[PDB]
Amino acid sequence: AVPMDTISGPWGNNGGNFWSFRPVNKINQIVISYGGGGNNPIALTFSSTKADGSKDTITVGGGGPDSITGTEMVNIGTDEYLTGISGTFGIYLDNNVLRSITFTTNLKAHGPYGQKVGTPFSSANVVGNEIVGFLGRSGYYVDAIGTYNRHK
Amino acid sequence: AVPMDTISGPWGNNGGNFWSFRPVNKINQIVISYGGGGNNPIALTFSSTKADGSKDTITVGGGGPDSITGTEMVNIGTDEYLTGISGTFGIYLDNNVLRSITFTTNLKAHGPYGQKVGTPFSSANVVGNEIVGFLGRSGYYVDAIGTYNRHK
Ligand SMILES: CC(=O)N[C@@H]1[C@@H](O)[C@H](O[C@@H]2O[C@H](CO)[C@@H](O[C@@H]3O[C@H](CO[C@H]4O[C@H](CO)[C@@H](O)[C@H](O)[C@@H]4O[C@@H]4O[C@H](CO)[C@@H](O)[C@H](O)[C@H]4NC(C)=O)[C@@H](O)[C@H](O[C@H]4O[C@H](CO)[C@@H](O)[C@H](O)[C@@H]4O[C@@H]4O[C@H](CO)[C@@H](O[C@@H]5O[C@H](CO)[C@H](O)[C@H](O)[C@H]5O)[C@H](O)[C@H]4NC(C)=O)[C@@H]3O)[C@H](O)[C@H]2NC(C)=O)[C@@H](CO)O[C@H]1O
Ligand SMILES: CC(=O)N[C@@H]1[C@@H](O)[C@H](O[C@@H]2O[C@H](CO)[C@@H](O[C@@H]3O[C@H](CO[C@H]4O[C@H](CO)[C@@H](O)[C@H](O)[C@@H]4O[C@@H]4O[C@H](CO)[C@@H](O)[C@H](O)[C@H]4NC(C)=O)[C@@H](O)[C@H](O[C@H]4O[C@H](CO)[C@@H](O)[C@H](O)[C@@H]4O[C@@H]4O[C@H](CO)[C@@H](O[C@@H]5O[C@H](CO)[C@H](O)[C@H](O)[C@H]5O)[C@H](O)[C@H]4NC(C)=O)[C@@H]3O)[C@H](O)[C@H]2NC(C)=O)[C@@H](CO)O[C@H]1O
């Protein structure tokens, strides 16, 4: 049996389409796309820059016609890596979807981004753990999210 | 609990790093990167073009210093979708890694690409099944590969 990285979660709901992104190099940039002219998350982008200049990337959510009205940009820089996430799920335009999210690294907590309303979730804060990818479900918005994990 | 798409495999070996790529739209572009001046697979690229013009993409393998010496380009066009994979694992430069691969769609078999030596694997051909993503392991080369699946 070929080992796979241990999954935390996903947290959230069963709507939308499954998605998964675990690139071989470090995820160093995240985009939270907002809709509705407020801080309403509608899509997430995760990207990993390769030494050859290529960039692994995925965008999940934003599958409907919603206009993106704003973004938050998150950079995970040198000697920095993702260690945890937390956030909330709740109603946006009659959908129970991601409403806020925090990306925590070994250095800082990036966030919270969005609206801190709704049902909470948080990954397990494990000393020496690195989030090396994400998975979940999405459609118009982000229906669920979890993590792939690897120890330092 | 939050459903995830059913995994077939992975087939192969336990070396390298775990990787995973299940984009929300269809994978329409594959690159098989070769090394060594022959058809020796060293990396795989999977890409999915979104209607907004963004392109989800992952490249796995090619993590060492090897020069890319050739490629095979695979296009999965309109009314076409991936349905199965097959190939072999065997020794390349003292590593037991992917040596050949075929990408089968509802229209055509694309391949075999590489060298038809080594230990065989193939996914289950299921009427109405669609491969919606891939996962596996990789380092310098491709150590293992499997599929995410969704039915029509
Ligand atoms: C400009 C502006 O600001 N306008 C505002 C309006 O937007 C707003 O109205 C509200 O808008 C939201 C957002 O658009 C609406 O929510 C969406 O609704 C659509 C349509 O579905 C609803 O309407 C249908 C009738 O028109 C009805 O049949 C549906 O059942 C649904 O009805 C709703 O039902 C709920 C209760 O269940 C009620 O509370 C609602 O009132 C009622 N609405 C209506 C109008 O009647 C829906 O598609 C959207 O869902 C997608 O996204 C969410 C979030 O990510 C996911 O959870 C869903 O699963 C949907 O994603 C799709 O998921 C399926 C799987 O389930 C995927 O299918 C797979 O596809 C793959 C290929 O990928 C392959 O083919 C597989 O085989 C297949 O299974 C699919 O891909 C995926 N889609 C995408 C794009 O990825 C979302 O729920 C809301 O309904 C609407 N409300 C009202 C009252 O109108 C108003 C304020 O209300 O304000 C304006 O200003
Ligand atoms: C120009 C030209 O054509 N030159 C030709 C030569 O290339 C060729 O020589 C052969 O080359 C190949 C390819 O370069 C060599 O194979 C690679 O070797 C390296 C180095 O390791 C070997 O050498 C060490 C000493 O030098 C020794 O300590 C090692 O144990 C290993 O030794 C080999 O052992 C085998 C038996 O097991 C013997 O048969 C060999 O003879 C012997 N060789 C030597 C030289 O002694 C190795 O790194 C490469 O492995 C990576 O890639 C494979 C395939 O994908 C994976 O299966 C591996 O796991 C490796 O990937 C790494 O995997 C680890 C996890 O296991 C990842 O670590 C994680 O990383 C994350 C971050 O991503 C995080 O930090 C985690 O914490 C961490 O765990 C890691 O990321 C990942 N790496 C990458 C880049 O992704 C590969 O095996 C071959 O050894 C060599 N042979 C000889 C005899 O020299 C010659 C012909 O032979 O011809 C020339 O022309």
For position A59, which CATH number holds?
2.100.10.30
A35 touches chain B (CB under 8 A): no
User: Distance between CA atoms of B35 and A124, rounded to whole angstroms?
Assistant: 41
Structural domains of chain B, count: 1
A17 touches chain B (CB under 8 A): yes
Coil/strand/helix, residue B69? coil
Which is it for the CA torsion B13, B106, B20, B95, positive or negative? positive
Q: Are B121 and B88 spatial neighbours (Cβ–Cβ below 8 Å)?
A: yes
Coil/strand/helix, residue B36? coil
For ligand 1, residues with CB inside 6 Å are: A 15-17, 63-64, 93-95, 97, 138-141, 143
Which of B18, B22, B60 is closest, CB to CB, to A4? B18
> Which segments of chain B does DSSP mark as H helices, in order?
none
CA A105 vs CA A57, A85, A110, A114: distances in Å:
19, 9, 8, 18
Resolution given for this structure, in angstroms? 1.7
Compute the distance from residue A13 Cα to the ligand 1 centre, in Å: 14
Residue nearest ligand 2's atom 42 by CA: B94
Edge-first strand listing for the sheet containing B119-122: B109-114, B95-105, B82-92, B119-122
Compute the distance from residue B14 Cα to the ligand 2 centre, in Å: 13
User: Distance between CA atoms of A61 and A141, rounded to whole angstroms?
Assistant: 4
- In single-letter form, the type of residue at position A117 comes to V
CA B111 vs CA A22, A95, B92: distances in Å:
26, 43, 19
Range of the domain at A86: 1-152
Q: Are B145 and A31 spatial neighbours (Cβ–Cβ below 8 Å)?
A: no
Q: Which of B73, B72, B60, B76 is CA-nearest to residue B26? A: B76
Q: Are B144 and B137 spatial neighbours (Cβ–Cβ below 8 Å)?
A: yes
Which of B59, B133, B150 is closest, CB to CB, to A56? B59
